[PDB]
A and B are shown apart, each in its own frame.
Chain A
């Protein structure tokens, strides 16, 4: 767990009566977006979305643009095929999502590769962890499996995941080193708001942290609480960092029995916080 990942996320959406399907891709290293492409843009091109990628030459942007354009066309055929496999009408909108990439350890070695697909938000077919075989969700996906085996796609995906995917991720980690291999710890505080004259809300905050993975837990007398607690989804601040909070409703006068425990990669040691009344 000085580990890193590269992921690409492709979204193709049909829109009958409103043109051909839109294709969008984005690429990430860990929680940092670095590229996009949108087939609806005035002139569709792979575009940089982080400072460290801007140095890549015109050959990089041109090649990758060509790749997304080819993939957009092929997703359109996939979408037509999938509509037939499920005996669906021409009138409805459908989504084909793709997500793929590689995970590496501290040393740059491949830990795991991924290449999978969803249709209308439901798992459809996935390259297994072996990078040689597929898991299909239903009889429709079994047809896609048969086509993928005939074209020997798993072999080619294995070669991309073990090769280019890891070599490029290593390159990005070195070029964006100052941000991508920096953990920013959370800045924390606990607030207190009376609800009634017999209960109060304690809210434990974490701000300014990177990467997004964090755990915030409230204990009462040192036992984890999930009762009378609210925990919001980790959310982006817009300056690359993340935010999260967890709250618990407590009996007035019992605040000192409650502690907020914070774990993050940026922290040498987990924190234990309490509310401190001014």
Chain B
């Protein structure tokens, strides 16, 4: 165990448009070992219906997973991804920015 900490991107399936249904994605990659905890947050609160992809890995043996949920972005609502892994002292939160 040299371990590797996850890279984290938070983004939407389609370009965001206020009031239009879409999917919110949190893509975690580059990590080892494979146990990981990922939550999607709306205004700091855990979203309940979140799905994820089947565990797979890259050529360098690092794992990746996509977590996703349906959502309708607004001007005001804030979204984020919260990640915990053995490699992190405390969970990491990455805020959704609609231009990233």
Contacts and interface: CB of A to CB of B under 8 A. Distances in A.
Question: Do A's and B's CB atoms come within 8 Å in the complex?
Answer: yes
Interface of A: 9, 11, 13, 24, 26, 28, 33, 36, 38, 49, 92-93, 95, 97, 99, 118, 120-123, 191, 193, 203, 207, 232-233, 235-239, 243, 245
B37 interface: no
A9 B13 contact: no
A9 B100 CA distance: 30
A239 B68 CA distance: 11
A121 B99 contact: no
Interface residues of B, number: 31
A122 B33 CA distance: 11
Interface in B1-21: 1-4, 7, 9, 11, 13-15
B66 A238 contact: yes
A233 B33 contact: no
A125 to B, nearest CB: 13
Given A93-B33, A120-B1, A238 B99 contact: no
B13 A121 contact: no
Contact of B34 (A13, A38, A232): A13
Interface stretch (B39-47, B54-62, B88-96): B54-62
A184 to B, nearest CB: 15
Most buried by B among A99, A121, A232, A243: A121
B85 interface: no
B57 A97 contact: yes
